[PDB]
């Protein structure tokens, strides 16, 4: 009866979930491996540019002190200030002129907010 | 007995609705008084 | 993909909070409220102006403060991730699994409010559904695309009838005259304000005869946040519409104890300080119930159908 | 001392004073105008900008140029002493009998602290009110809260005066007992008229009951805040006496309906949204703070007993005032308009009456061992009689059995002799004797609820034992 | 019979393992795709 | 800690300025006297704090300090044999340090900080601990109190104290994160304590009363409701439940009772003796007391405090029975609080969220797998007191919608000296069908059918009351007078139960099964004999009537022999009769 | 505008015995049909649409089910006009605004229907106007006034509800058109208390 086919279906679902979470773990490992490789300055500068474009009236730019020398170039360009903060890595945040709004562009947050749409895309790739 | 009981139940609903409407009116006028005092004095 | 934070909280009272400089929050949007301890809560923009925007918190507001709380936009319109693999699953009424299995992969994300059907696009319901009960089948026959409620009482066995109809419902294609091939059938079951005992009863009833393999369950307990009771029938009907009008299923939707839905609606309305109706119920209750009940029907040019059987208990008979 | 003169608003009972942040919330103040007349007031709201004062009486002569406000007391307090016995007060502690003011031993806040529940003990002793339908069937126990429900035209004031005049303890019925234990009566009247005031004064003075009583009298045209304050002052005096000098005090609150109306008016004057049927939402809490000040305390010999009196607004027990009173008190005594119009005084109706603590204050070692059974038998027999009285109107007397006729006669004898005692004062033994004489009308063996021992001991006395001088 | 349930369980385990291996035959490409999408 | 000053005072409502950073519903101390209150609204730099006690005598500018935490209870050793108010204040120590009155602003600790406890460690350094695990044990009267790590704490053990005597304040376990774990911890009363999994109502909650256990049973972890008519012996039934039910710990909550009613319960319990140990019953109960003149907030929070304590004792792995007395008074307090907040009423003046609060209270009951892997349960029996017995009250309608059983106590049965005075026609239970397998496995496989037969006989007796009313009973023919008399026998010998008797106060399930078996066998043989032509008066004086009527008072261990002897005598007597 | 109102003197034949005999209505008259749910309002109005002797029928589905409009759209093209012999749908105009459509549009739909009826009257025809439920229009007015924060009359309705209803119902009548011909409008409105 269906009492057997249900076991097959639930085993398939469990296996698919394990596959997807393993993919997620590999993805997060690859993302956290980024600061150790020379690809980081360009992507962090692009993320800072995106954050500054999100806030037309942005006042100051905030990131960790390691990224401050690379964000000095953008600071001279757009004219915004820069300050140090032990914030989340793999991204740069900005502060609005009034001080009531703020944008954040960490890569882990991007993964968190993009996985819901990327899951159905990668599911076809896996099978 | 059921007819009189139903009439009593209906009258209770009518009176309850009137009381609720009066409460709403009082709430609105108190809100207006408070707004006037707190914004225009 | 980046996120924007709003920290101009100026006023918190009951279920409402005001955000100062959020002019780019759209009306009706869904937001996330984060406090100092990292806990996140949901909210909806019920009124937006130049001075401030008004957000109704989906739950209690203990622990929020004007110094550390922040608000972020989740999505402009409330949406649900739907897939054909939802059959044989259980959810809590807000879309999250409670059966212990991994979450589904959304084939599509659909707004939960839906859109009205064009009356020109409709067609007349013309085929029946066999519920296995002689009185209904013979004297008050159900028809694909109908909405036929059950008026129960305070001690009558509404749950047993609901479970029996869910188990026994069938389509009978052989009687159609043409002897057509077998067609897919599904049941979407939504329970609102349910207790633990009834939850266990429904779980065992669906597991006993294998009916769960063709069913989707949205189960909302009586101790859940009052917002979840509002959104459960809408998610159930979104799933039903998706299945019926994209995969030609004949789905049957059973909404149990709409009285609890009315109580939740009254609570929310009284929270927003609206004008009351006949017995404290909101004046717009007719429109709100219509937006749920009129999602059923049959569409010209499509083979699927949606049928609803609301269940409610008349207070004091 | 220091006076505030920054008045900026006068309307109705309210006036606003600027730069008065020194005034504590709830303080009592004196308001003085150009002609030198002084009025009282209470502080109902304090802010950094202004304070709000509710004026006693009326604001006729006030103006924004010459009025000044000065502080009297941070918290409303009353000076108490054993010298208060035999005195009359107006409801804010001001003497009105013309005698010099008392010298207080101490000054106590009128709002009372709650009794610790673990400090209370179980009430176990009864009070002899002198009225048969109360002593026998609805016994009042020391520490009980037993209200009286009355109508618009019913004589509740006369019953209150009679109870205050007659009530006493019976130490000689409890073992050996002690011959002397002090007893006092505290009488509080709220919103009464001049006629009732004169009646109460004459009744208390003409029999010597004033020597053991304290009176707090508040008239109908007096300020409503005084009406609010009166029961709290009465209960403060009662608590002081009972729990510092070991008195047994009986407190009578003349009309709680007037108190509820005054509370509603005060709440409306402060712009508060009313609850059910226009009454304040916190009405239950206020009534509880008033009623729950009675009881008996472990380790203390004193006690406090309360008999609230309230007239039902339209003879409706579903009205909020009686309904909320029922939740807090132990039973009720209900007057009957039918008995009153029939000429029976006091018109107490046994059937709707009930005393929830009666079973503890009766038995052996207190009153008499046949009390409870006799009361139950009287209740059942009276119910049967009043039913047969309606049946006989249709079917006629001849169609009745002998027992039905005997019940019908019993009901009439009960109404004429047991309830209709008039101004006569009856001890508990006299009431029990009358009850047994009336029970002797019924045949032995029909007394199902009475044990054979008491039937053998007491049954068989003829009505002439009280018929000789009813 | 319990034998049918055992047979179904063995078939389920075999198919789950086959799916897991098939997925392992694609994992790195999927990870590369995810990093391609998430990066700016 | 956020500190500010008073800006405006208006009755119980106080507005404090400079309170930026204060959080909603945090407990605050107002004024120099430190009166406690809650923050109910935040606006700019100001916060709306509402004080519990009276605010008379306060002045503008007095300090206001926020504790930073919501309303909470202390959970640890020392709660048993205690008496508390609605916000967990030990009344006995308040009396000892204050007298007979409860002064404002008095501060005492729920758990005594002076008493020594016999600590016995059960962990070692290097172990990994997660919420709900047992760190050690402490003897508390007859109980072995288990000290539990708080549900939200995880880490590794650094050092553990040795066995010895310590107060509830000495840290017994220190974690590598620096966290110190003591013998007690605090928990918000409005958040349910976590569990692993909720189990189905498979086992019954044996109360010891035949009618409740047989006709209208309640499962362990279930819920029940009972009305409060005067003179119906409700208190006797409640204290019988406390004495005889198989629960390990009893929590009693009185939220809005009259002063003398609370005095009765506070005097009666210290005299009851626990039949299991032979000692005082008070060693296994916790009392919460609230009179009508106590602050409204305490009366509203009493049931939440009680259910939180019950949940803690469940998490220790026990079985807890919770009795909430007069939930109607709690609803009245809730209505008053809603009225002070200026909310629009729904139906009979109650706030529209009354049903939500009642459901949130009642849904905490249930049998669970605790975070420590053990099994525990909480059973709730809540009294409802309508204004005049009106079952259409919103409180009663909301309560009956969620509870699984309803024991309609009746004053009429008590009037006729029938005890327990429970009306079997208006009552109902929803736990029979789910509990049937436990009956089949643990008492008898025939038991459900026997119970159904007894209920059918009772219903048949009820169906004839019209004819018995219209015509005197003796005019009815033999076969119907037979069912009348067997119904009388049932009422007198099975349903009735004297709680004051030494052996009849408690009845096991197998004893009730034997009594029902005897009654049904007698009824069957009586009907057979009636068909054989005997008169009913001949049956009415058979030798077995005394044997059946006296089955109640035989001992528990003696009962099987008596039962088989009576079963033999039943067949013996009907053969002698023609 | 019109030239002159006239006193109605000819019947509006509905085809139902009870209404045509016991409680007649004239060509220029107005009628109301209140009733609880399931009583038969919509069936009666559809019978009037199918069988009456009016030249043009205007049906206003204000706030009702969509299936009721679908039934008309499907069945009417197959039926026969009672007087001209052509298809029935050729004489009918439908204004539909179902329950889940926007609330404010109900008030607009009522006026659109009545204005079209007046235009066809001005051409010299006899028009019958069916209003599916005026209670939904009243509910829309209540909602709009609630947004305006106006003080309400009984049951939360705005105090000017009666004026709106009177202005709507006064458009019916038999008139002499500006062009000199004769026309009429008959209004039947259902109420859902
Ligand atoms: N289970 C029982 N077994 C024997 N006697 C009982 C039982 N229950 C009650 N009774 C007797 O009947 C009386 C019931 O009336 P009483 O007014 O005293 O009840 P109570 O327990 O105080 O409750 P309530 O508050 O509902 O009146 C008890 O005092 C006792 O004498
Ligand atoms: N004249 C009639 N002849 C036959 N059946 C009728 C008639 N009138 C009504 N019915 C029956 O009653 C049912 C309900 O009628 P209808 O749809 O007109 O209700 P209504 O009054 O418009 O109600 P609602 O408020 O639900 O719109 C119809 O579906 C039909 O079965
Ligand atoms: Mg209709």
Numbering used by the authors:
A (entry chain J): 61 to 187
B (entry chain G): 169 to 209
C (entry chain E): 3 to 319
D (entry chain D): 5 to 474
E (entry chain I): 81 to 120
F (entry chain B): 1 to 578
G (entry chain C): 194 to 386
Question: Anything the authors wrote about it?
Answer:
Cryo-grids were prepared using a reaction mixture of nucleotide-free V/A-ATPase, containing the regenerating system and ATP at a saturating concentration of 6 mM. We determined three rotational states followed by focused refinement using a V1EG mask for each state. Hereafter, we refer to the structures obtained at ATP saturating conditions as V3nuc. The V3nuc structure, obtained under ATP saturation conditions shows all three catalytic sites occupied by ATP or the products of hydrolysis (ADP + Pi). The V3nuc structure is formed by binding of ATP to the ABopen of V2nuc but the binding of ATP itself does not cause structural transitions between AB dimers associated with the 120° step of the DF shaft. In the V3nuc structure, where nucleotides are bound to all three AB dimers, three distinct but associated catalytic events occur at the three AB dimers simultaneously and these events are coupled to the first 120° rotation step of the DF shaft.
The V1 domain of Tth V/A-ATPase (A3B3D1F1) is an ATP-driven rotary motor where the central DF shaft rotates inside the hexameric A3B3 containing three catalytic sites, each composed of an AB dimer. When powered by ATP hydrolysis, the V1 domain rotates the central rotor against the A3B3 hexamer, composed of three catalytic AB dimers adopting different conformations (ABopen, ABsemi, and ABclosed).
